[PDB]
Amino acid sequence: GGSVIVIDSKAAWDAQLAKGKEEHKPIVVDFTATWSGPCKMIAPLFETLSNDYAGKVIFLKVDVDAVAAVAEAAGITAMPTFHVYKDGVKADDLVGASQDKLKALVAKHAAA
């Protein structure tokens, strides 16, 4: 129950990145896997933050095994990974399930 946009394909990924560019809003992405406990531990927080920052920050989810072409091009190797995209390109990242660092990352880019 939040505002996260699920990415199903490279085409969908490219469209969302272009939307963030056109809107001048930052995108935060959770690259996640069903088999990762840490991903499960932080997924509820990602969803809550998508509500708290609705209208300000765009939240995407990429299941790395469902959309392997996007995970590979993004250079993912540990789960969860969070990226921030601005102007169609990567601007920031976090790897791991630190709730404090995720909250701070979203706050930073919402305030920038």
Q: Report d(CA 112, CA 109) in Å as an integer.
A: 5
CATH code for the domain in which residue 85 is found: 3.40.30.10
Q: Report d(CA 110, CA 46) in Å as an integer.
A: 14
Domain total of the chain? 1
- Cα distances from 95 to residues 23, 24, 49, in angstroms, run 26, 24, 17
Distance of CA 49 to the CA centre of its chain: 11
Q: Are 96 and 80 in contact (CB under 8 A)?
A: yes
**Domain enclosing residue 14, as ranges:** 1-112
Q: Report d(CA 16, CA 33) in Å as an integer.
A: 20
Segment 16-20 long-range contacts (CB within 8 Å, at least 24 positions apart): 16/58, 16/60, 17/85, 17/88, 17/89, 18/88, 19/58, 20/58, 20/85, 20/86, 20/87, 20/88
Read out DSSP for 30-78?
EEE-TT-HHHHHHHHHHHHHHHHTTTTSEEEEEETTTTHHHHHHTT--S
**Cβ neighbours around 58 below 10 Å, total:** 22
How was this structure determined? It was done by: X-ray
